[PDB]
Amino acid sequence: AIKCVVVGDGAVGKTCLLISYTTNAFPGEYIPTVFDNYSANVMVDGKPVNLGLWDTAGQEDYDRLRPLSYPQTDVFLICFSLVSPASFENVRAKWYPEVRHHCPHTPILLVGTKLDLRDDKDTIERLRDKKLAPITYPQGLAMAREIGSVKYLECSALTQRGLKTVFDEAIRAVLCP
Amino acid sequence: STPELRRTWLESMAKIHARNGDLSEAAMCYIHIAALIAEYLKRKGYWMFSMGWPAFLSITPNIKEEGAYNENILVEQLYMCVEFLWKSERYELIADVNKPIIAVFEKQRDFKKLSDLYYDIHRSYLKVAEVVNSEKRLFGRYYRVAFYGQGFFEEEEGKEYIYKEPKLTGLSEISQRLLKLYADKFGADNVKIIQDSNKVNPKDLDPKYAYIQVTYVTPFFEEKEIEDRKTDFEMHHNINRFVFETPFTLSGKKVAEQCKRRTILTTSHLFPYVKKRIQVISQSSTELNPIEVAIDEMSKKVSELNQLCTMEEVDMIRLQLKLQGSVSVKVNAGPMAYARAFLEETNAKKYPDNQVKLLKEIFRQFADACGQALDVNERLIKEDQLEYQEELRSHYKDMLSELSTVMNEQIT
Amino acid sequence: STPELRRTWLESMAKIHARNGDLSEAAMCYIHIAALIAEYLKRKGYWPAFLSITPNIKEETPYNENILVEQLYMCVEFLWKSERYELIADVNKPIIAVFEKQRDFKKLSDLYYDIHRSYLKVAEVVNSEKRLFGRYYRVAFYGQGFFEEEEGKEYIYKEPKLTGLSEISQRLLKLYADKFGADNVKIIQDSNKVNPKDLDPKYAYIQVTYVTPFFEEKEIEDRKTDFEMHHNINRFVFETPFTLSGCKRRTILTTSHLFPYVKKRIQVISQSSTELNPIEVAIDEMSKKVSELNQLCTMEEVDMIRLQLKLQGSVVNAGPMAYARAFLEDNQVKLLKEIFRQFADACGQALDVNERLIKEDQLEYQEELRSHYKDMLSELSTVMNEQI
């Protein structure tokens, strides 16, 4: 019965991730479809639950047509990849100021996606051409605590690591605030 | 496995299955063990009442697998079985197993016990009426695993298997679990998840690393069986084939160039069985090109919305989402990308008709219900959410317009 | 073919059984009704499948499943009213096959409960004299020159409760006497033989004789239960003992169909009678003796004073010391069946069951009979070799 938003810059793997979870098939192998806005039910702590997921665009031209669905939501979350910190810079400033403007007191855990690549040498090689890549969990925990959030979670697209826990603490934010 | 030895296997397998939440299978263990002694006592001619081991083929076909000690032992084993079903949330088969019990009590004439034997069958069907089709019962999430590697794995050096994991164990759990269980028995690093889904066999794996294909699967049935397997229990009881849709899109992966492959695999012995795992054997593939899947997958999101309305509950949260997937597409293709590619006047000249004709009736039924859906979302919106739904029908009304231009036809 | 309207004969015929207050015949109607419906939907693909219920179901157009179940539903409620509880189960047994296929559940439950209510209702009334199915009587009217069914028809009638002999006859006469000739019918009190022309024509005459659904030895094992003595009985034997011709004889006629039935009476097909050797008359009474006491010991909630009297008779001017005349020689021995006399002895296992039951008010009436017992025991067990 739970509502839950997925903010974030475009191509922070928002859709790429949720597609891979609700349908168990490993990322990049997700059987693709249109529609968008996904959901499925998960076993947490002890009880089972139905968890709902609203997809949001980071594509700029869909502002003003985004906030109208934030009504009714019971847990929020903001998605940034630890890949491009241009998303990390743009999430303190675009999405916390957006949460204060609609449902400003419902928990919104900010989460880091695409952890897998933080040890990939061929991407640190493209990262060193512009000399930026790491987004460290010390800074991650601190950006989210200073963003008054509840938890930051280093999650990964593939390798499955970091995952599961996120949707779990999404509802674990609701049960035990 | 001899009479004396094949019996001892089932027992300690029951208490072991009992010990660690493998209920249904421990339950199945006892009624499968109790058939084994039914023939051995038939094989000495000590005497469906007393008819060898096929009388337990009623509850499961794999009861045959046990044929290759006295009467009160035969009834103490079903008695122990029936309770194991009572905890395994499988209230139904308890009727098909109290038959040979009654068939002997009616032979020794006891009545009181036959009375409270017929009572606990009523005490089950009653608990069913508030369980069945409430989605309270759940076992589910059978997985398709395969080991690959010679000079690595001993007995299971390659066979393709089908695990029955329990409750809501997703793949994040079982994958990390097999990886971890086998990564530390042959050194780290060299334990590749091999997430593939494709019927791998080329073994272009540089044999210094060991692979473990995993791919979620679903109890698969046809059109005539789907009338028979109506509720949530009936689909898990005795399943031959599970199917998984595997994408084989041209080149990498992700409207017109995207294709998927249904590969069904059977399971030899029928679920539920004694041992948790059981092997696959064949993966027959029905390939669906980007129009056949368009017909079938755009049909998929049609019946689903229609299935949230016949429901009595209808939870304000679960509706508004799926219609946003239906009317207000964002960060995805959109339901209209199907129209422009396989329905526009310029398109749909080499695709056969009747195909495209069925795509019409699915398209309309997907509309006339889509509109029925927005009205219900108006029944439990309440307060602020009303300003929102005012946009939902807007996106929907516009969706009708564009559908009319691609199709050269009026859309109401 | 046809009587597919005489399916309404039975419904009519049933309603008179219900009005007659003869309900055990009645429930049987509604079954053969649903037995006949079950062949018509079988021939058109939409039959003797009740053979467990009653084997004489061989003698069996807009129809539905719902109309078939409504034929069953209104039969169980006759069974439960007839007090023949044991069969509710074998009846309600395939009504569930179509409710499980249709998966009504909420009906599968409270049905499976009605069948639980049955076996819990028979365990309370079994081994109580509370079950009065009815009484059996062989009849025979010989109106060769009058209004006889065919010729001298002979066929057994089932009267309910405990009335009979006098009650059935004096009811049978005043009922045949108004359609026949008043004061032209005959009593015919003697059971043996009965052969026409050996009595001058008065142009009527009817016969009446009590009978007991006699079972063999092989049957008395499965027929240990109370309702089993009154179900699937193809034969009733009546004992006609000349005792002297001045040995005992017994006629064991078999009827054509199996009780129960849609009609209160059915035709016989064979009268079979045998005189029993004198030494054969002993093993019949002294063995009927042996089981009568075993039945009083076991029962539980024993009728008490009934238990007391039965011993009091077992010794001696006419006591069961008939074996004093069956030991000192006499006929075809065949082990004399004195081991059947030897088992009747161990019915001394009665005196102990009495010794637990009384109060210390008769704390002496017991040693008193335990002395008439021992005195009648080994001391009169001298004519049978050793003692027990």
mmCIF file of C-alpha atoms in Angstrom, chain C residues 191-329:
data_model
loop_
_atom_site.group_PDB
_atom_site.id
_atom_site.type_symbol
_atom_site.label_atom_id
_atom_site.label_comp_id
_atom_site.label_asym_id
_atom_site.label_seq_id
_atom_site.Cartn_x
_atom_site.Cartn_y
_atom_site.Cartn_z
ATOM 1 C CA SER C 191 -46.560 -71.840 8.777
ATOM 2 C CA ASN C 192 -45.292 -75.162 7.439
ATOM 3 C CA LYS C 193 -45.772 -76.311 3.828
ATOM 4 C CA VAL C 194 -48.994 -74.643 2.576
ATOM 5 C CA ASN C 195 -50.027 -76.251 -0.708
ATOM 6 C CA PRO C 196 -53.306 -75.500 -2.515
ATOM 7 C CA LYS C 197 -56.227 -77.870 -3.126
ATOM 8 C CA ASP C 198 -55.258 -79.267 0.298
ATOM 9 C CA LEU C 199 -57.811 -76.822 1.721
ATOM 10 C CA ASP C 200 -61.239 -76.307 0.184
ATOM 11 C CA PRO C 201 -61.737 -73.042 -1.753
ATOM 12 C CA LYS C 202 -63.296 -70.216 0.211
ATOM 13 C CA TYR C 203 -61.922 -67.877 -2.513
ATOM 14 C CA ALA C 204 -59.406 -65.737 -0.585
ATOM 15 C CA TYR C 205 -57.028 -66.782 2.239
ATOM 16 C CA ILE C 206 -53.768 -65.112 3.365
ATOM 17 C CA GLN C 207 -50.754 -66.350 5.346
ATOM 18 C CA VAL C 208 -48.559 -64.583 7.922
ATOM 19 C CA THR C 209 -45.257 -65.681 9.458
ATOM 20 C CA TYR C 210 -42.553 -63.780 11.336
ATOM 21 C CA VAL C 211 -39.036 -63.978 9.926
ATOM 22 C CA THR C 212 -35.518 -62.836 10.851
ATOM 23 C CA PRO C 213 -32.965 -61.723 8.203
ATOM 24 C CA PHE C 214 -30.808 -64.784 8.768
ATOM 25 C CA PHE C 215 -27.079 -64.542 8.127
ATOM 26 C CA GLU C 216 -24.587 -67.353 7.565
ATOM 27 C CA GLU C 217 -21.440 -67.681 9.652
ATOM 28 C CA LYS C 218 -19.266 -65.862 7.099
ATOM 29 C CA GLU C 219 -21.721 -62.952 7.203
ATOM 30 C CA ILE C 220 -22.058 -62.628 10.999
ATOM 31 C CA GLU C 221 -18.500 -61.250 10.982
ATOM 32 C CA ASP C 222 -19.115 -58.238 8.743
ATOM 33 C CA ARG C 223 -22.700 -58.012 10.053
ATOM 34 C CA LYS C 224 -21.442 -57.215 13.565
ATOM 35 C CA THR C 225 -23.021 -53.761 13.457
ATOM 36 C CA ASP C 226 -26.557 -52.682 14.230
ATOM 37 C CA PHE C 227 -27.546 -51.234 10.851
ATOM 38 C CA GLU C 228 -25.754 -54.029 8.980
ATOM 39 C CA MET C 229 -28.422 -56.501 10.098
ATOM 40 C CA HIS C 230 -30.936 -54.392 8.104
ATOM 41 C CA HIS C 231 -29.011 -53.534 4.928
ATOM 42 C CA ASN C 232 -28.240 -55.634 1.835
ATOM 43 C CA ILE C 233 -30.368 -58.551 3.035
ATOM 44 C CA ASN C 234 -31.450 -60.869 0.216
ATOM 45 C CA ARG C 235 -32.893 -63.500 2.553
ATOM 46 C CA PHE C 236 -34.887 -63.907 5.762
ATOM 47 C CA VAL C 237 -35.029 -67.304 7.516
ATOM 48 C CA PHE C 238 -37.883 -68.342 9.796
ATOM 49 C CA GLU C 239 -37.575 -71.334 12.145
ATOM 50 C CA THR C 240 -40.547 -73.743 12.129
ATOM 51 C CA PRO C 241 -39.685 -76.404 14.736
ATOM 52 C CA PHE C 242 -41.808 -79.534 15.019
ATOM 53 C CA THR C 243 -39.677 -80.326 18.112
ATOM 54 C CA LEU C 244 -40.965 -83.914 17.985
ATOM 55 C CA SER C 245 -43.413 -84.256 15.113
ATOM 56 C CA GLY C 246 -46.000 -84.573 17.862
ATOM 57 C CA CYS C 247 -35.807 -82.232 16.035
ATOM 58 C CA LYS C 248 -36.381 -78.720 14.652
ATOM 59 C CA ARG C 249 -37.045 -77.497 11.112
ATOM 60 C CA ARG C 250 -36.430 -74.093 9.564
ATOM 61 C CA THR C 251 -37.325 -72.413 6.270
ATOM 62 C CA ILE C 252 -34.784 -69.946 4.863
ATOM 63 C CA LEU C 253 -36.491 -68.233 1.939
ATOM 64 C CA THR C 254 -34.538 -65.721 -0.147
ATOM 65 C CA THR C 255 -36.166 -62.672 -1.678
ATOM 66 C CA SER C 256 -35.442 -61.291 -5.147
ATOM 67 C CA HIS C 257 -34.331 -57.753 -4.321
ATOM 68 C CA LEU C 258 -32.308 -56.326 -1.426
ATOM 69 C CA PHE C 259 -33.838 -54.373 1.430
ATOM 70 C CA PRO C 260 -34.366 -51.573 1.523
ATOM 71 C CA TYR C 261 -36.501 -50.633 -1.458
ATOM 72 C CA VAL C 262 -39.087 -48.211 -2.819
ATOM 73 C CA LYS C 263 -41.937 -50.549 -1.767
ATOM 74 C CA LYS C 264 -42.498 -51.968 1.717
ATOM 75 C CA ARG C 265 -42.546 -55.534 0.321
ATOM 76 C CA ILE C 266 -40.743 -57.520 -2.379
ATOM 77 C CA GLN C 267 -41.177 -60.913 -4.039
ATOM 78 C CA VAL C 268 -39.343 -64.037 -2.923
ATOM 79 C CA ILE C 269 -37.722 -66.378 -5.446
ATOM 80 C CA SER C 270 -36.875 -69.457 -3.355
ATOM 81 C CA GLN C 271 -38.189 -71.011 -0.135
ATOM 82 C CA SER C 272 -35.482 -73.245 1.347
ATOM 83 C CA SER C 273 -36.261 -75.336 4.408
ATOM 84 C CA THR C 274 -34.368 -77.943 6.411
ATOM 85 C CA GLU C 275 -35.113 -80.013 9.486
ATOM 86 C CA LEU C 276 -32.257 -79.888 12.008
ATOM 87 C CA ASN C 277 -31.019 -83.112 13.673
ATOM 88 C CA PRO C 278 -31.787 -83.280 17.426
ATOM 89 C CA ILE C 279 -28.123 -82.987 18.443
ATOM 90 C CA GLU C 280 -28.078 -80.199 15.839
ATOM 91 C CA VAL C 281 -30.873 -78.415 17.734
ATOM 92 C CA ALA C 282 -28.599 -78.146 20.771
ATOM 93 C CA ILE C 283 -25.723 -76.273 19.108
ATOM 94 C CA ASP C 284 -28.282 -73.786 17.773
ATOM 95 C CA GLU C 285 -29.725 -72.795 21.163
ATOM 96 C CA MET C 286 -26.648 -73.157 23.389
ATOM 97 C CA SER C 287 -24.654 -71.032 20.919
ATOM 98 C CA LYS C 288 -27.337 -68.363 20.625
ATOM 99 C CA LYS C 289 -27.024 -68.514 24.409
ATOM 100 C CA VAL C 290 -23.263 -67.907 24.355
ATOM 101 C CA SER C 291 -23.495 -64.697 22.313
ATOM 102 C CA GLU C 292 -26.430 -63.233 24.251
ATOM 103 C CA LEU C 293 -24.233 -62.906 27.347
ATOM 104 C CA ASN C 294 -21.123 -61.643 25.532
ATOM 105 C CA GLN C 295 -23.459 -58.963 24.178
ATOM 106 C CA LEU C 296 -24.579 -58.009 27.699
ATOM 107 C CA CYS C 297 -21.078 -57.946 29.206
ATOM 108 C CA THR C 298 -19.569 -55.743 26.480
ATOM 109 C CA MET C 299 -22.300 -53.186 25.612
ATOM 110 C CA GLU C 300 -21.263 -50.787 28.425
ATOM 111 C CA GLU C 301 -24.042 -48.911 30.214
ATOM 112 C CA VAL C 302 -25.418 -52.410 30.681
ATOM 113 C CA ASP C 303 -29.143 -52.751 31.560
ATOM 114 C CA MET C 304 -27.945 -54.084 34.991
ATOM 115 C CA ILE C 305 -30.928 -56.156 36.190
ATOM 116 C CA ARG C 306 -31.011 -57.652 32.696
ATOM 117 C CA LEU C 307 -27.449 -58.847 33.337
ATOM 118 C CA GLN C 308 -28.477 -60.300 36.710
ATOM 119 C CA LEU C 309 -31.386 -62.406 35.436
ATOM 120 C CA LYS C 310 -29.459 -63.991 32.556
ATOM 121 C CA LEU C 311 -27.017 -65.692 34.936
ATOM 122 C CA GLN C 312 -29.742 -66.706 37.427
ATOM 123 C CA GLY C 313 -31.099 -69.019 34.727
ATOM 124 C CA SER C 314 -27.737 -70.622 33.915
ATOM 125 C CA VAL C 315 -28.293 -73.181 36.702
ATOM 126 C CA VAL C 316 -31.493 -77.220 37.190
ATOM 127 C CA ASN C 317 -34.719 -79.109 36.493
ATOM 128 C CA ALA C 318 -34.639 -77.465 33.043
ATOM 129 C CA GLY C 319 -31.328 -75.595 32.970
ATOM 130 C CA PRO C 320 -28.830 -75.492 30.116
ATOM 131 C CA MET C 321 -27.402 -78.729 31.514
ATOM 132 C CA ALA C 322 -28.824 -80.261 28.337
ATOM 133 C CA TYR C 323 -25.237 -81.483 27.847
ATOM 134 C CA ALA C 324 -25.999 -83.999 30.594
ATOM 135 C CA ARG C 325 -28.019 -85.573 27.775
ATOM 136 C CA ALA C 326 -25.190 -84.677 25.335
ATOM 137 C CA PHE C 327 -21.977 -86.310 26.587
ATOM 138 C CA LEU C 328 -22.828 -89.805 27.865
ATOM 139 C CA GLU C 329 -22.410 -91.556 24.497
#
